[PDB]
Amino acid sequence: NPLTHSTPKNFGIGQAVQPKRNLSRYVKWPEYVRVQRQKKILSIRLKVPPTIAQFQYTLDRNTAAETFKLFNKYRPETAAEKKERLTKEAAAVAEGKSKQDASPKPYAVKYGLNHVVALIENKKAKLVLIANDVDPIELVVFLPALCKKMGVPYAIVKGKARLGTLVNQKTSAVAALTEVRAEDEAALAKLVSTIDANFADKYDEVKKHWGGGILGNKAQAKMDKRAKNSDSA
C-alpha cells in the first residue's frame, strides 16, 4: 500500500493517449455489410407500397408458437420413416396383393409455393402461413390477395427458415394445412379464428394503409428540434 500511488492520467484533448474505447460504431465494414445495412435503410426510408406493411406484419409470438406446435404435430414423413413405409407397403402388396392401401392415409402439412397456390385455387387448404422474409417478394405478394379472394384463412409468419425446419427443409416460404384430425380440430378452429381476426378481417384496411417513410435517427432529431424552434414563443 505505501509503495503504490495514484497515477491517474488525464484524457483531455491534448493531455494523454486516449484509452482503447469501443469503436464498433466507426468500423469500416465490408462492402457486403454496407449493402445489407443500406438496403434495409433504403427500404424503410422509401414509401413502401401496401404489399409491404401488409408483409412485415408478422403474427405475434404466442399465435406463432401455437401454429408451429400444431404444424410440428402435423410434420411430414422423413427419409427413414418413408423407407419403412415403403418396405411395409411392398411386403403387403407382395404377400396379399393389396391395392397399395395397406399404409394409412397421411395427414401432413402441404408446402411448396406452386402446390399451395393450387390448393388455394382449388379451395382445399384450411390454413395458410406465408413467410415474411421471401427474398424476391414477387413470389408471395399475390398470396394474401388470392387467399382473401378464395376465402381461405391466411397468416403472415416470421421466418422462412422456421417454415423450412417445419417441413424438414432449409426454406419453405409457405405452409398449408388442408386436413385436420378430429383430435385437434377444436384447437385448430380456435387458432384459425384468431388468425382470421388478425389478418382476413383487416385485409382491406391494411391493403389501403401504406407503409414506410421513416427517417433516420439524426433526421428525426433534427425534425423535432426544428419544430420546437419554430413553435418556440
Binding site: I13, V17, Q18
Partner: protein
C-alpha cells in the same frame, strides 16, 4: 495545321512538374477531433526551402492523440515562425502568428493564410509567398465568413474552414528583377518546362493561329471567345477589356 504548344502541354509528357526536390505537399493536419473541439500543441522543429516554391516550409511535429507516436506535418511557414516553437492548432487556440484557428474562431479583420476553401481540405487559399486572406465579416446564422482573397476577391466560405494566422513568408520576391535568362532558366527548370516561350507571330501558320505572313503580325483580333475550341484559344481569352489601364482595382 498542326497541334499547338498549349494543346501539347495538356497531354503533358515533358510538361509535367519537376517534383524530385520538393519536400512534400504543404497541407494542414486533418480535422479529426482535437482541431474542432479544442487545440493541439505542436512544435515547429525545422524551416526549410521548398524547391519550386517561393515560400519556406515548416516541418512541425504533433503527438498522436490515439497512439503513442509522433506525427510530422508540412506547413507553409508564416513570417516570424522560428524553429522549435509552439504552434497551436484547433478551435480553442489563441490568436497568434502560426496558429491554425478556424475562420469562425478568428475575429473580424484578422490576417490569415493557407486557409481552407471547405472545412477539411487542408489549405487552399493564399499559399504563395507574401500573400494572405483578410476576414471581412461573419454571418453566425448559417455559419459563414466573408473573406478577401489576394486577387482582391470576395469569397463566402464555411466558418469551420481553418487557416494559419499570419502572412506567408518569403514576401517581396518578385520585387527583385531576374536580370538574366540564366536566372529565369534556373527558376523554371525547377518549376516546370514552360520557358523559354517562342512567339506565335514568330512561328509558322502551321504552328499557330498567329504564324505566317511577310510581316510578323497577328492578322486577326487577338481577343478569343470563351466558346472557342482547343487550338483556337491563343492570345487573350474572353477579354472583357484590353489595353493599358488607368485607375485602380475598383475594390
Amino acid at each position: 495545321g498542326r497541334v499547338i504548344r498549349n494543346q501539347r502541354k495538356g497531354a503533358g509528357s515533358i510538361f509535367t512538374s519537376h517534383t524530385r526536390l520538393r519536400q512534400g505537399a504543404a497541407k494542414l493536419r486533418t480535422l479529426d477531433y482535437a482541431e474542432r473541439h479544442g487545440y493541439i500543441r505542436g512544435i515547429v522543429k525545422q524551416i526549410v526551402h521548398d524547391s519550386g516554391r517561393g515560400a519556406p516550409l515548416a516541418k512541425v511535429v504533433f503527438r498522436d492523440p490515439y497512439k503513442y507516436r509522433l506525427r510530422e506535418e508540412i506547413f507553409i511557414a508564416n513570417e516570424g515562425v522560428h524553429t522549435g516553437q509552439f504552434i497551436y492548432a484547433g478551435k480553442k487556440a489563441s490568436l497568434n502568428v502560426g496558429n491554425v484557428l478556424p475562420l469562425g474562431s478568428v475575429p473580424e479583420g484578422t490576417i490569415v493564410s493557407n486557409v481552407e476553401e471547405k472545412p477539411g481540405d487542408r489549405g487552399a487559399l493564399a499559399r504563395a509567398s507574401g500573400n494572405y486572406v483578410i476576414i471581412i465579416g461573419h454571418n453566425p446564422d448559417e455559419n459563414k465568413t466573408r473573406v478577401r482573397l489576394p486577387s482582391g476577391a470576395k469569397k463566402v466560405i464555411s466558418s469551420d474552414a481553418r487557416g494559419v494566422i499570419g502572412v506567408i513568408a518569403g514576401g517581396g520576391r518578385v520585387d527583385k528583377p531576374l536580370l538574366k535568362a540564366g536566372r529565369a532558366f534556373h527558376k523554371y527548370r525547377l518549376k516546370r518546362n514552360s520557358w523559354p516561350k517562342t512567339r506565335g507571330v514568330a512561328m509558322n501558320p502551321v504552328d499557330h493561329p498567329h504564324g505566317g505572313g511577310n510581316h510578323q503580325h497577328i492578322g486577326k483580333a487577338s481577343t478569343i471567345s470563351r466558346g472557342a475550341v482547343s487550338g483556337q484559344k491563343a492570345g487573350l481569352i474572353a477579354a472583357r477589356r484590353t489595353g493599358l489601364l488607368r485607375g485602380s482595382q475598383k475594390t
